[PDB]
Amino acid sequence: ADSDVPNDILEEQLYNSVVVADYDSAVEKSKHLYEEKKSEVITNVVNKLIRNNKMNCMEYAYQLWLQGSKDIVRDCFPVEFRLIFAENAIKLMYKRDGLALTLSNDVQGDDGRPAYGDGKDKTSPRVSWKLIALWENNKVYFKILNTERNQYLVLGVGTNWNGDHMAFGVNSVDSFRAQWYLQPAKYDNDVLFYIYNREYSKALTLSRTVEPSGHRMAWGYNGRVIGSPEHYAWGIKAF
């Protein structure tokens, strides 16, 4: 009888449940709350996780999605979380510039197609991406597939003077350089995500330098990103 527990208390223990990464328990309490009509408990927990930039939010959503609770992700989480986990075509839009992430037309080096924010285009099939979930080591990571080119996003192994790594599309996952993790954030009314490389733990960002073409190169950033989602974070929209 969850009716007999204050709502504030129900929020807290689900939230604690997620933050300590106890996912069977969070999924179990969630299935029960939803059942008894208490969905706002869940929605409040989700908003708290997003505001506090809680990485465990992603594991939470993904577990809900795998464990027969697609209904919960759909109802208590912003539409982004359904696009991620249903693996729908998305666009990745960099909050600071409003630029859409894409791969270059021309294959440069073994490196594959340099990635960058497109100075103009937010509509062509070049800008469509898929995020493909995997569970390992009690965490959730994603491969980021560019759908037109069928190439995966990665951080090159070399650095520039500042320790930043270029981002490219390549044909092959051999390594953690092709896998990423997400941290949710709230800006204005947006749900935004910091997007981190699994090998280097650096955030995917767009350079401040505009190319002669109007494009800005995509890098893994050597420096602090958190606390600045309008500079470092990505919004996710349906393609």
Residue numbers in the entry: 1 to 239
Q: What do the study authors state?
A:
The study reports two crystal structures of Bmlp3, a protein belonging to the 30-kDa lipoprotein family found in silkworm hemolymph. Members of the 30-kDa lipoprotein family are the most abundant protein fraction in the hemolymph of silkworm fifth instar larvae. The NTD consists of six helices forming a right-handed superhelix and is classified as a VHS domain.
The asymmetric unit of Bmlp3-p21 contains four monomeric protein molecules, whereas in the asymmetric unit of Bmlp3-c2 two protein molecules form a dimer. In the Bmlp3-p21 structure, the NTD and CTD fragments are arranged alternately in a head-to-tail fashion, so that residues of the NTD have contacts with residues of the CTD. Although the protein molecules in Bmlp3-p21 are packed more tightly than in Bmlp3-c2 and the solvent content is lower, the results from PISA indicate that in the Bmlp3-p21 structure there are no specific interactions leading to a stable quaternary structure. The crystals of Bmlp3-p21 were obtained with PEG MME 550 as the main precipitant, whereas ammonium sulfate was the precipitant in the Bmlp3-c2 case. pH was also different, 6.5 and 5.5, respectively. In the Bmlp3-p21 structure this cavity is occupied by a fragment of polyethylene glycol (PEG) from the crystallization solution. Through its ether/alcohol character, PEG is a relatively good mimic of a carbohydrate moiety.
